[PDB]
Symmetry: D2
Subunit: 122 residues, 4 copies
Amino acid sequence: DQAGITGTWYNQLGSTFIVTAGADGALTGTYESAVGNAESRYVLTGRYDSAPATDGSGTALGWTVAWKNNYRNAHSATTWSGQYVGGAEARINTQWLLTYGTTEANAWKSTLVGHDTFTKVK
Amino acid sequence: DQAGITGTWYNQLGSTFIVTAGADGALTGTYESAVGNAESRYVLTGRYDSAPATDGSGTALGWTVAWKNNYRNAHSATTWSGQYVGGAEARINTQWLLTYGTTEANAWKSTLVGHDTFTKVK
Amino acid sequence: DQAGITGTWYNQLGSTFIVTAGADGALTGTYESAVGNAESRYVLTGRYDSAPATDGSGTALGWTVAWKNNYRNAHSATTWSGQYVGGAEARINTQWLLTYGTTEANAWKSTLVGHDTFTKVK
Amino acid sequence: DQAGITGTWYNQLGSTFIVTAGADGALTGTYESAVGNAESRYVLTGRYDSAPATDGSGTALGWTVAWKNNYRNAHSATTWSGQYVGGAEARINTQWLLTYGTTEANAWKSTLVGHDTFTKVK
Ligand code: NA
């Protein structure tokens, strides 16, 4: 599925996820968010199951973006956890956690949760 | 917080998180889980905010493990999203998502959520 | 939105959510899951913001089902947290946590997370 | 566990959860938050597994609060999902989702996630 995963993906918000899957299970690339306090590309890294089950289960993967680049620093980081589902309309189905740096007093509201679905087209 | 983050951490379950924080915002290391379908070390990668706010906010970070190594494949991946809090008893406070690859019929129950707190001692 | 909310809703799995919104902010009804260790109807209760913002924001709400009725006991409970969005195709957009009763040794994997979208038609 | 659950609990933030567990699996009571845009008591309702497993598993439960009372309206709702653990130091261990009413353009950041642990003392 390294072939399957490698490439450019778009989520329902119009964000762009550019990724390369290595044969060793690495994920590397860039992320551009259509929303939030964000501009241009941000480095991402992650991991995926490079020897998935052959029973038509999806392929588990996840990755992280820290929302700091040369343009902006949102003092936050998102991780997406999900699975790649192959076939005619390939999808990465995710849930994500966004944590922003807070004081201890604000720690209770430090983390957003959502869900993003990525496809190969817009 | 490069120095602050780099090192060996343990969570409340007795899992071991060995990480290096690069100056470019990279996290690299290994993870050993005291629980689940897991043995020995697994590669992790992630990102952290390499220029955090100076108002006493934590430092946002996240990382991923795909639960495949030379011993086992759990066909799953966990992402931790959280913040590093410096000082006498330093902490990484996280929330995590564990997605396991499923059929589309089992997709609704593909994801676990939890929270791990990491300290520099057991 | 009392009127808007009250009635029969269906999610993307084919589950059926039958609810009455009281004027005091109460939600009462039954839930039938198309998936999992579930048969027939289960009691639900919840709350909703009975005086929402008038700026086009959704209406916050949540509810709980404990997965025990006269047929089955899954020893678990789901809460849905989300918002009701009015207009031509009304939606309830949710995220949910499902916790199942565990031993302390299995507590780390006690909780599932997902997202359900409910509409007035199947 | 009806007697077990019924009563006053406190979480790690100093919030106060006052609950009655009915024989039919109902949870009714009030919640006061030590944090956020909250004052005084708010109605809660929820459900719990009134016939738990006898193998030393916890008891599943959940409840909702809509953050509207006679003082304030935060246009939001939290659901807690978790389990009651009996014994010398009884605990309710939860994860929670807080959704606030948003426009469709801000839906992606409408939901916070956390974890609260409740005990019988502060
Ligand atoms: Na509820």
